Point group: D2
Chain length 115, copies 4
């Protein structure tokens, strides 16, 4: 599993459950193609988005739909979503964990890249 | 001044100087129009992006060009840029400060909305 | 002003107002002496804690009383306080800004050291 | 396992390996008693610090020795350590994951509390 997403809720101290995640890949003409999507689990994790075969070198965008998450909890947040844009596998195949820590007016994101 | 950006470097403990910043506004057909841009100052700040007259309600995107910043310092970073996408809402007079704290493989962003 | 503290609330998107802040300095026998304290202003800031004369090299602790802040807002928080422990070093004229971004179950802290 | 610690390095995009962690519990006379300690694994995790039986209600401090970590990498950081102080099990037995994201001049900490 080369690409995993983990989302945490800093208001409740819990995994952020059922958060929509969309992944896009930049295509040959400065257009962004849909690549994968899913919802985070009860542990705040999203696995199985892609395979090593399909996850080729390129520029990827991970969109985490934070506004819909906070609104479901009755909170009107600042951000529409959290976005993580990066080049993948430009130095060989890597495993990527994209983590996000969510608050209504702030988020932190971190990438753990392992070989 | 209704929209200010502040960028900090968590590796050097300093303002992030000469960072390119681009602001976009979502247009009537889900397309994004260039709105304002600049480079951060010696204090890590960018002021004077817009006026109260032009900064109307809408969806805005602030892109901070973090990869070029780290490459200038000799550090190999993860993200292409840091992105902050948000709705501006008239709920009384508001000033928006978008702050970002930068590390090579992580960033934190915060919005301070004051009257 | 060589030591300033800035505290922000990531739930409200605002300065954290009327937060108690305590500063300690490590003494010659691994004991911690009270050094300065105050409450953050309407801008989330605390200035005037010390002078250049008294702010000598040493180990310092900044305690931010986050639990009392969240309890005043009706939010059940995790931490008793946020703590920032650091060495001050003479390497040219330096000003220290200690910033903290607060959420109920998370905080981020940053030190900006400028000349 | 009711108390786990996870430490990440935001400069390298990796788990923070072999980081010393010390846990203290506040005792009856405003003194802090040593409770547990260890080093993070290759995954940046520290498990097995305590048992449900021994992890009683109280105020705990988790000290993460970040300065020694950065110095081993040749970096002189700002903080002596990252510190996380909290009340545990004051609402029944919980499982606590204390996570820290480390940069030379900034750190973020988050608690995931699960039942």
């Amino acid at each position: 599993c080369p690409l995993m997403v983990k989302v945490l809720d800093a208001v409740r101290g819990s995994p952020a459950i059922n958060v929509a995640v969309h992944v896009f890949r930049k295509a040959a003409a400065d257009t962004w193609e849909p690549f994968a999507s899913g919802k985070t689990s009860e542990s705040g994790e999203l696995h199985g988005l892609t395979t090593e075969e399909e996850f080729v070198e390129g520029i990827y965008k991970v969109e985490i739909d934070t506004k819909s998450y906070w609104k479901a909890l009755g909170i009107s947040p600042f951000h529409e979503h959290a976005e993580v844009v990066f080049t993948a596998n430009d130095s060989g195949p890597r495993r990527y964990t994209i983590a996000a820590l969510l608050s209504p007016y702030s988020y932190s994101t971190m990438a753990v890249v392992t070989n």
